């Protein structure tokens, strides 16, 4: 019945073969079968005659997609957690000069990854930057926030402005005195 | 460990903080295990060299 596949490369295939008990364990726990074809270089996820969760089989499709895009197994079980979400953001369709593109995604990732990790803390998601793709997984509020932020980041506002926006926003919503105010009296 | 991390990133292409030629990387490994204090930034002898 319901079945999906995804290709991978070989340097991840080593990791796949070394961890492959864990994915089939979690997935037959959710009554999802998974198999692995080496000459095909692909993974396969299918359902059986007992599976009762369409949400979880779409989730398993997301699982092999993320594992093909080379995120480790802690993040894999964090997406197979229910109220989480993967999300892919492309940046390659913004700017003209290649060198400016390089320096701008370096401005994103920041010295010692610090801007990226502060963003990950303040949104409770995980980010990973691959050239023209940026993968992110976590809750939907953090995902919407990081989508706005990275699009303005490959535009030309700075992530430091965004990080100050995030911490001020989270505090101002934490103090349970304001829910009517548009908060632009506080944000610069 | 740092070299295997660098190889996995550059094989499955990630970006990473660019550091000078002396020091090592700075990972969650070294931050949690707290190895900077008992190994250091770099080989100081080769640094002066």
């Amino acid at each position: 019945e319901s079945s999906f596949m995804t290709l991978f490369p070989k340097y991840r295939e080593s990791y796949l073969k070394t961890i492959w008990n864990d994915v089939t364990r979690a997935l037959d726990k959710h009554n999802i079968a998974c198999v692995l074809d080496l000459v095909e270089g692909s993974m396969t996820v299918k359902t059986t005659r007992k599976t009762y969760d369409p949400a979880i089989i779409l989730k398993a499709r997301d699982l092999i997609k993320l594992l093909a895009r080379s995120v480790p197994f802690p993040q894999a079980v964090k997406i197979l957690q229910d109220d989480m979400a993967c999300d892919v953001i492309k940046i390659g369709n913004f700017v003209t000069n290649k060198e400016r593109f390089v320096k701008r995604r370096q401005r994103l990732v920041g010295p010692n990854g610090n801007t990226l990790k502060a963003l990950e803390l303040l949104t409770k998601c995980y980010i990973l930057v691959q050239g023209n793709t940026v993968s992110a997984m976590g809750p939907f509020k953090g995902l919407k926030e990081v989508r706005r932020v990275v699009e303005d980041c490959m535009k030309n506002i700075h992530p430091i402005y965004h990080i100050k926006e995030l911490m001020i926003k989270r505090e101002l919503a934490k103090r349970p005195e304001l829910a009517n105010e548009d908060w632009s009296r506080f944000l610069p | 460990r740092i070299k295997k991390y660098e190889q996995e990133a550059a094989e499955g292409g990630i970006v990473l903080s660019k550091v000078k030629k002396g020091q090592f990387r700075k990972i969650e490994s070294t931050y949690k295990k707290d190895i900077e204090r008992r190994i250091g930034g770099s080989i100081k002898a080769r640094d002066k060299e």
């Binding site: 990854g113 610090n114 990950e120 803390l121 | 969650e28 931050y31 949690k32």
Partner: peptide, 25 residues
């Protein structure tokens, strides 16, 4: 980058992650 709280949070951004796995104040 002249701010005081900002950059301290920025360089502690990996330490709080490592000892956490947010109480950042």
């Amino acid at each position: 980058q002249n701010d005081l709280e900002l950059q301290q949070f920025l360089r502690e951004s990996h330490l709080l992650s490592a000892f956490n796995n947010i109480v950042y104040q």
